[PDB]
Amino acid sequence: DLEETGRVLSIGDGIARVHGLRNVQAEEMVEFSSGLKGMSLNLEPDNVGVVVFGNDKLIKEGDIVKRTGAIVDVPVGEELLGRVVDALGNAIDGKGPIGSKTRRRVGLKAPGIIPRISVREPMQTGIKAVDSLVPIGRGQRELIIGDRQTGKTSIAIDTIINQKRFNDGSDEKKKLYCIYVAIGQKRSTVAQLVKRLTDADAMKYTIVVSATASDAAPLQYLAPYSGCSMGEYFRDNGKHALIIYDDLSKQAVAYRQMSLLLRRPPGREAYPGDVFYLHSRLLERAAKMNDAFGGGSLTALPVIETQAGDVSAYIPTNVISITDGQIFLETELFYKGIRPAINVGLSVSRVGSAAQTRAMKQVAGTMKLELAQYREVAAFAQFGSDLDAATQQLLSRGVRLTELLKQGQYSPMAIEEQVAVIYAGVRGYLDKLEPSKITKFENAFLSHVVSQHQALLGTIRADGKISEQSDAKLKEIVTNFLAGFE
Amino acid sequence: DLEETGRVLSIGDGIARVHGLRNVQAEEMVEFSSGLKGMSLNLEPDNVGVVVFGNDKLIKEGDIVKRTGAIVDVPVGEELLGRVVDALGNAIDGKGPIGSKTRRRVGLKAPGIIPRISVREPMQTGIKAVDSLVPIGRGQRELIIGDRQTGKTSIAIDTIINQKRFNDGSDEKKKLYCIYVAIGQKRSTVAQLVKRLTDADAMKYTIVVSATASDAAPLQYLAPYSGCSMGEYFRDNGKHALIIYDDLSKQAVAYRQMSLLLRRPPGREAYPGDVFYLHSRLLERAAKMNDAFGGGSLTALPVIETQAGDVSAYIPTNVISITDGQIFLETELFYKGIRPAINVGLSVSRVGSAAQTRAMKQVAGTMKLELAQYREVALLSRGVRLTELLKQGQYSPMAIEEQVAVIYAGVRGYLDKLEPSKITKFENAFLSHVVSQHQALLGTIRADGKISEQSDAKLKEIVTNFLAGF
Amino acid sequence: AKLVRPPVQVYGIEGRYATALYSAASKQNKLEQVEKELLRVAQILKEPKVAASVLNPYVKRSIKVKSLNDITAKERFSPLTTNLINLLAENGRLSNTQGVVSAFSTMMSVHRGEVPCTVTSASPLEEATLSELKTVLKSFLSQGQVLKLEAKTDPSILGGMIVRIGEKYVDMSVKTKIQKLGRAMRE
Amino acid sequence: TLKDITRRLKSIKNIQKITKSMKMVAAAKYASEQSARMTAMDNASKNASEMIDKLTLTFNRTRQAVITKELIEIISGAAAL
Amino acid sequence: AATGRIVAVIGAVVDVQFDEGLPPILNALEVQGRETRLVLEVAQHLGESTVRTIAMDGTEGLVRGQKVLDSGAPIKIPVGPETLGRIMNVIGEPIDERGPIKTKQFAPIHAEAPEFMEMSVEQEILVTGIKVVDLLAPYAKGGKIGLFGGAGVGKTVLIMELINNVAKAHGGYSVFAGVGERTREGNDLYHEMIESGVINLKDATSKVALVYGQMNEPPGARARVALTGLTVAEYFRDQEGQDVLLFIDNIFRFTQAGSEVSALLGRIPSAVGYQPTLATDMGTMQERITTTKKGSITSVQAIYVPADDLTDPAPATTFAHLDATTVLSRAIAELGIYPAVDPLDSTSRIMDPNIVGSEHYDVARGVQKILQDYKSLQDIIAILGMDELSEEDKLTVSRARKIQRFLSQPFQVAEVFTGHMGKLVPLKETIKGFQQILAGEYDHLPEQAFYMVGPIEEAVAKADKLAEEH
Amino acid sequence: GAGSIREAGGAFGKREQAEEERYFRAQSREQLAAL
């Protein structure tokens, strides 16, 4: 145990300027005499700028700093499922050590142009609005952007809870392992989230990487890359992972702190010149591999909090530029009763219908066209009774489809039932019903189709489409329940 | 020596880097070989950063700097009453020296929690809108905020002129000694102001601290604290003082210059990091003392000029979050004829009806409610009568009983038939009438503090017979 | 003009003047002489009258460089040392002089192959084990280096010895051993 | 002020949409006072979109200036170190 | 322990050179040769055996070379039941003139946050008796609350009403931390706590501990006083298992204090002129204000929002540390509705049908929906006026205005501001009244019948009286 | 931007407030007299 060392020249704000360490590498992990860790971010001619993985009151001028000789790496594997870990993969849930066998560097490069295939398989969220209008595919990077307290974490958590139907089944091709990175959150918020995921039995296929608000800025900066490596393990071994960075605004803030304290040249909003490079090299790692590489995938759902809806801020601009689409949430829609408060006019998915089953494609093309026409003529509500019959019909169908998209929290729907409800909606079978009842109907009807009509739901689920037998049977079920409905 | 004495390393822009001076304290007053004074603000390993209280034309590289051993302090006492002084206490009114026996540090600490007591006595400004809807009590900090040429100094000068009725009487509990601090103003503006104060015979109980636009930035930075010490003398001897800082925007500008030249890093709008501290440690020294400490008070009326109505700027937000209430003056209201242009929807007084006489409390509750309801529907004629009743001529501050009388004549109905363009006319005539014949009723309301049913009925007949005669 | 850079680098004003002088002295093969002359000129520098006259900020740089010039001529120095002192006086870095000096010194500290290595122990250990570690350690060296040991004694390690060989660092102390065992006990 | 301009832009975009819808309703009912209302609300929507275009130009200028002012503050604070 | 010397004094930042025994960061150092106790907290190691420190009091009169002694620990304040009924400052000195605080144990004001396995997920509604809070954004026992507001919207009045109701209903050692506020409000609170019996100067059954560092303090004291109050509350939670209430007013000042030293510590500013370490400083402070498995801490923090921004980095960063935000609006205070709680901007994590019951949740969502619809209809009302609205829409606007007035409530602490009496409305009465207004059960009553009433029976009685008069 | 016109102030937000107050003081008068 002969080790190459250096001395702390100075320490402050979590930055240690270290003498010596002549052979340390850029982004190499070093270890202080206190037991604290650090990462060499600035290699300068006379000092090394180390960022401290902890509290700098333990580091004093003159303390010995050892090398480890290794870039930062984290444990990966299936032994991490059901665990809450920190940014470096140490268990923080008190359930014993992580019995992993493999380690993976947190800063590996993304797959190239050739190892990829197009995004074609659906990633079901269980939210009607997302799965129908803003579809997400396996290998996509869909941004969840919105103001505070607009329902973003709820979208992530429904997407995580929904995968239980696929993970309890036997189809290994449709299993999705979830990873939730929490950056800069309270520990009690993360404990509430972990409890919610345990109650839903969603922990057995979920990893929770937790770099909370009292953790040092290097840990919050590193937590997305740790989680991304944990998911790249699955992406590389023929399996499919989903990762939710909640949220990347706070990681950008942590990185800006580290950079400003290292005296790196500030830019717009004091962010360093390579904050785009930060988020882009994090997000290009979510890929879809071709069958020559196992066929695995990693889907990224980064979260971004905008201030007053300002999507022209620096970090929102960057991450909107990087991703493959966005799910935008509004607070006005939230308090109007539209929940999940998804703004359909602004939301987009540049993958689109290539990430939908044929059944949802059938009903969702119609629903999208109809809600678009509704949005065009929607200002004329408050006056609509004084326009054409066609305009009143557009308004009627639009409000019916709007109420059809509302959904409860923590209750993700299977794709067959979503298709059945959107069928009842876009086929006209809700025009004679008045709006205040749609949601109610939507509930009761659902129970009906779940109880006495497992054959149709199972056949749609097995076919992926609504064939003519399926279509006519759905027609009959809808009209019967509607005629006999209170 | 190099312990009690130093040598100027470099001089420029009113900052002197001094060599030596090993024993000098932070914020100590040093003296250059030319007769100028300075304050030691940066104690650095190799030099002292001295801010010069004057013109650095006379300081040369190599000059000798000596110590005074004393942290900056000003003369205090009653001898300063009637005098015009500069930021360091030197008289500039051309009347010889001030025979002060006491000197007081300018950077003292505000009283704590224990020495204080709740704000109970009213500070009468003589301005119906203020005395009625945004009242001020002795020991309060009331901000006068607005754009340029909206009427802030007018409010302050009306306030100072009003206290003559109290200062020439007998009861020492209602006397208020005023202090006007002029920061960064034009010198002829201050001469005009001292003229308005002397003509109204208000200068006998007033001190004017003048740090005008040609005075060095240290002097303009230091003048509010000098005025505050001159007022704390009265506050700590059982007397009541009132201080006006006109204005603190220019003090913050002087402090920003002084700091940027000391090479201290700039913050928002190049203002130093601690400009909030700059104003908070000053405005916290206005306080009401408990009876174990004499019961004296110091009331602060800071003034803030906003740019184009931007109360969301740095310095206005700082001083708004420090003070106990704000008088908002708007230009839109000023040109519509509302003078003093007080925006009542925005004017706050965190002390409230506790700082008010009971009679004015009664009538002003009704006035506040009626004026709120009128600002909702813009009865309409009653609100118009009242809003015209709030208007007031300049340098004409009214007594509290006459304010009560006119608020009453407008709020009980005795104006609802009169013509709006005649209201003002009526008003002044009415006042003359009362002040010619009904000194008994007014002495009654003044000494009683409230309006009894006897006084209520008496001025009932007064206003009725008048409105008939008018 | 290509430089002869020293084996170890020093940075700052001290490092720049020391590197300049090392390069100038290696071109003329006068390194040891310049070394002895800087030792002497630094000990001259620490003279109280001379220190008072050289640190003085209001003395004109003309008189000060003339003073350093004549007081170097009183010593009969090499042209390299004379020009160094005049370059330091002309630039106003005389205050850094000793620093510069020591920099050059520590530069040649490694030129002679002298490897600095300190052995911290609990209580002052006697010379037998010290020559033992002398011999067993000079095995750690490359071609032609000699040890500079500084046996320090802090008992707060309560056993073993912490050996810093240049920049290599072995922790044979018992405190780290027992803490490592304890961390294995708790983790 | 950026917040002033954003408030005013929102208000006037809302006025524009309301007058546009009132114009459409009047042009429906027009199948003398109804034609007058149709033209009045059409002119109101034209003027509202004019004001919206001017205010959008002002808004863009002001937000660019705000970004530059903050950058200059950060750069000036960093160059003092 | 170790002794060093002052080598530089720039504002509130002091550099100290230690020859032997450099102190760790966050240690408290005592300056030798001063009249009062001056403490410097180590912030950085500068190299060359010099440390940069932040001063906890004023730095006037400091001399280069003055001796500084290392204490060997952070600031240690006395903790224990003896602190109840006392006032201490940032460094634990008693500032109530009642003598020393003889506790048997002292705690350092810097500690680590509780771990993840120490968190509790229990969410239980804390009924305050305030209509809007309990209805739309109810507080939870053991949760963090946070009250957002600009200057003058009612953060102090709301926090004092919460003190009143809860703390006098509570049985678990409240703690109040005044962080950079007005000293006048500190004296006011101290005395309305003495006369309330919550603080007992004799027969020590006091149940509140007060920690105060106000606006006149240097930046260091205002940045550490929140940690002092937090440490008192933490001792009560951990070493006694009690359930503590922690009131903090104002927590923004904590953040602001950091800014005022940031550049003087040599740090490049981040956005809006805030320290590059804003989020992590806020984190390491707020993550200690939490309920653990060892005890409970309900915390109410008044959060100043500069210029009514809410997007400023300080409030925007605070938002994610809270469980139930109450956002006070100036647009609502200017309507006359108090408290000025914004119903469409306030949030609570227990506004969950599985927690508050489906009736509570449905009433809350219906109130929020009708208020949003009123917003959407007000544009149409601005253009087409009121008479050209649908009948359903006139009904919406009527019920919405009634609900707006009914969210208003008279406070016991605002009895001077309003003249009204205090009302404390139970939870089921609130749900029932709002359900009845949403149902149409009070379409016939005027809207001024719901302004400043308690339960709905009071709205009915007020309508009957308002009719019986006229 | 649902209450954008009256959150902006100005003539279109102040006239809206005046119109609302007029209508509802009328209705409160014709509601109190019918009690």
Ligand SMILES: Nc1ncnc2c1ncn2[C@@H]1O[C@H](COP(=O)(O)OP(=O)(O)OP(=O)(O)O)[C@@H](O)[C@H]1O
């Ligand atoms: N579909 C829904 N139906 C009803 N309530 C919902 C729904 N989605 C979210 N909510 C509620 O809206 C509130 C805000 O949601 P959430 O916390 O998930 O969003 P967020 O953007 O992550 O907030 P934060 O800023 O704290 O991160 C929550 O109380 C949540 O319970």
Ligand SMILES: Nc1ncnc2c1ncn2[C@@H]1O[C@H](COP(=O)(O)OP(=O)(O)OP(=O)(O)O)[C@@H](O)[C@H]1O
């Ligand atoms: N109540 C009033 N009645 C009539 N005129 C007034 C009144 N108040 C102010 N004025 C006049 O309006 C002008 C405003 O001047 P004033 O000095 O009082 O305001 P200011 O805010 O201090 O402006 P400045 O930027 O010059 O300091 C003055 O000419 C003053 O005479």
Ligand SMILES: Nc1ncnc2c1ncn2[C@@H]1O[C@H](COP(=O)(O)OP(=O)(O)O)[C@@H](O)[C@H]1O
């Ligand atoms: N609940 C209330 N009832 C009546 N008036 C209030 C109420 N809250 C605030 N106010 C008024 O607003 C003023 C400012 O209140 P304050 O508590 O000081 O707000 P802040 O702490 O945010 O500055 C008060 O003096 C009072 O006049």
Ligand SMILES: [Mg+2]
């Ligand atoms: Mg969230």
Ligand SMILES: [Mg+2]
């Ligand atoms: Mg003026």
Ligand SMILES: [Mg+2]
């Ligand atoms: Mg307050």
